[PDB]
């Protein structure tokens, strides 16, 4: 298969340095031109850097020209990108891509690593439980006050998938994220099957397992 | 550079009907344009190249048309997987550019939502704040109304709301409403509502606690 693998995103300040790298396999990556595209939360694709088989040139759109880099090394295959001065409009996920042999689309693409350049601080969320109450039942976590995005959420180590909504966080004014992830299951359930949501916040290095259960009353 | 304009920024169409995207280049591109498609939390797929080819692995019910300035994605009888946003490219010449993107919602039938109300927890309140939480599950239309009452007054101002992209399953959508009060205010009220208005329920639905009561 086909794979690329985009890291290196984070939080950075305005005027700050970052250094986002691509790792290819299961094709022959110097035989391959390949691209930077990035995706401003909401917004649509821009392409950012081309970089050609060898190395040996390298194009850029305006908006970016004289800040950013594309380098390749094709004997470990990786694609790099350099970003300098950064400012906040940079904000986005950035997409490590392949160009399709003899055309120019974009015939694969990395997951994306996302890219914050803010003055923000980081600060990892608390985990509260949205109880199940008083047929089908609906409980949840809510996780609350963190900054940069994102944040990973699932339920029972990944063994509860069917009926769980992950909302996407929302900036409160406070300049920090919230969000909550909910689950519906059985009514009957609720006395014996134990339900954990698992949060991770990598940016500030916060895990955290919540147990959420019937309040007792 | 060359803009590409594509045309109804959201279209909804109901499943096994017809789907028409339109793309238009502001110079003569021929026909070197291609269509993306792309779910959300996801990367784009190339769907069509050479603006009518479909690429390799694409369902036959996507097809491409145009040549020119004038470019069309046809998806005949959509499904509800194909809910994305689906963006145009030209690479005719240097530099390549995308058009804007145009959303595709599957329009299923009109399903009430299901409302939970969740009490800010104990241990938050510790913390000087309360968080008051209100969801919707698995409704369609998208368009709804949530309304917080704390004794009779209802609250403006103080809360967010939060909705997930349409379910590729069941293309419905689910909804969150936080109202988020300081403990001292939490604890000088008691009886704290969300009403909700929505086309699939013959009037609206409150769901409702007390502060302090089971």
């Known amino acids: 298969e086909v794979q690329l693998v985009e890291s290196g995103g984070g939080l950075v300040q305005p005027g700050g340095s970052l250094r986002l790298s691509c790792a290819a396999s299961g094709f022959t990556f110097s035989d391959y031109y390949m691209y930077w595209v990035r995706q401003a939360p909401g917004k649509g694709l821009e392409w950012v850097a081309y970089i050609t088989k060898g190395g040996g040139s390298t194009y850029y759109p305006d908006s970016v020209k004289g800040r950013f880099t594309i380098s390749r090394d094709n004997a470990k295959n990786t694609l790099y990108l350099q970003m300098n001065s950064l400012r906040a409009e940079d904000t986005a996920v950035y997409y490590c891509?392949?160009?399709?042999?003899?055309?120019?689309?974009?015939?694969?693409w990395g997951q994306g690593t996302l890219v914050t350049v803010s003055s923000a601080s980081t600060k990892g969320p608390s985990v509260f439980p949205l109880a199940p109450s008083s047929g089908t039942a609906a409980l949840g976590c809510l996780v609350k006050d963190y900054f940069p995005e994102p944040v990973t959420v699932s339920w029972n180590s990944g063994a509860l998938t069917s009926g769980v909504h992950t909302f996407p966080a929302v900036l409160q004014s406070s300049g920090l994220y919230s969000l909550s992830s909910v689950v519906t299951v059985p009514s009957s359930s609720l006395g014996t099957q134990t339900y954990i949501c698992n949060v991770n916040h990598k940016p500030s290095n916060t895990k955290v397992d919540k147990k959420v259960e019937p309040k007792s009353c | 550079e060359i803009v590409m304009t594509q045309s109804p920024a959201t279209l909804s169409v109901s499943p096994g009907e017809r789907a028409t995207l339109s793309c238009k280049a502001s110079?003569?591109?021929?026909?070197?344009v291609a269509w993306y498609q792309q779910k959300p939390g996801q990367a784009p797929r190339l769907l069509i190249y050479?603006?009518?080819a479909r690429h390799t692995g694409i369902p036959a019910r996507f097809s491409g048309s145009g040549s020119g300035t004038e470019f069309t994605l046809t998806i005949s009888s959509l499904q509800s997987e194909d809910f994305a946003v689906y963006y145009c490219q030209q690479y005719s010449s240097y530099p390549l550019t995308f058009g804007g993107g145009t959303k595709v919602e599957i329009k299923r039938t009109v399903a009430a939502p299901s409302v939970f109300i969740f009490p800010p927890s104990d241990e938050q309140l510790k913390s000087g704040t309360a968080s008051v939480v209100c969801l919707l599950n698995n409704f369609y239309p998208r368009e709804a109304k949530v309304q917080w009452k704390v004794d009779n007054a209802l609250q403006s101002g103080n809360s967010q709301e939060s909705v997930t992209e349409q379910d590729s399953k069941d293309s419905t959508y689910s909804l969150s409403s936080t109202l988020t009060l300081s403990k001292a205010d939490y604890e000088k009220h008691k009886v704290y509502a969300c009403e909700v208005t929505h086309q699939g329920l013959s009037s609206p639905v409150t769901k409702s606690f007390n502060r302090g009561e089971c």
């Open positions: 110079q003569d591109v021929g026909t070197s």
């Open positions: 050479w603006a009518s």
């Open positions: 891509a392949r160009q399709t042999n003899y055309d120019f689309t974009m015939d694969y």
